Amino acid sequence: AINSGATLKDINAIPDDMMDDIYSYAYDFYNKGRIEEAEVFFRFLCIYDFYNVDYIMGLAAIYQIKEQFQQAADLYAVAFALGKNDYTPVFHTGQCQLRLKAPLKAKECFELVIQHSNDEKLKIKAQSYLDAIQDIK
């Protein structure tokens, strides 16, 4: 039988002050270089609240360091759909499409950041990438 029992036996709901504390550790383990450990905290956060741009961006940033570019890119796709005209995710999907050796999709991602973004610093990165592509093709 096993059953489950006279129980409780949750209540998986996690308090918000703890959901945030989890993010904090996810960031720390990221910064402090310990990647595979931070991939958990993120994969966890996404399992709970998947429509959070901050959590998706985190996870995607990890699949990108782990060099699993296809996955990181599909995630950035969503981070940008939840993206109220935030073009950061599109820039990185550019970096990814580049390492996936498909530079036509890559060129479009950067061209697109330049045309619609209001992040003056990001437009600079994105333009700088375009320039560096045609500089030794």
Q: Which two tokens stand for residue 19?
A: 């959901």
Query: What is the four-CA torsion angle of 40, 31, 119, 88, rounded to 10 degrees?
Result: -30
Give me the least distance between CB of 123 and its own copies, in Å please.
25
**Smaller CB separation from its own copies, 38 or 113:** 38
Query: Mask: binding to its own copies, 21-50, rule CB under 8 A, as x and -?
Result: xx--x----------xx--xx-xx--x---
Q: Does 71 bind its own copies (CB under 8 A)?
A: yes
User: Distance between CA 7 and CA 21 in Å, rounded?
Assistant: 27
CB of 129 to its own copies, least distance (A): 23
Burial class (CB in 10 A: 0-12, 13-18, 19+), 24: exposed
Q: Judged by CB, which is closer to its own copies: 4, or 31?
A: 4
Q: Is 82 in the site for its own copies (CB under 8 A)?
A: yes
- Interface with its own copies includes 100 (CB under 8 A)? no
Q: Which residue, 82 or 112, is less far from its own copies as judged by CB? A: 82
Is residue 80 within 8 A of residue 89, CB to CB? The reply is: yes
Q: Tell me which residue has tokens 């990814």.
A: 96
* Chain interruptions in the chain, by residue before each (C–N > 2.5 Å): none
How far apart are CB 2 and its own copies at their closest, in Å?
4
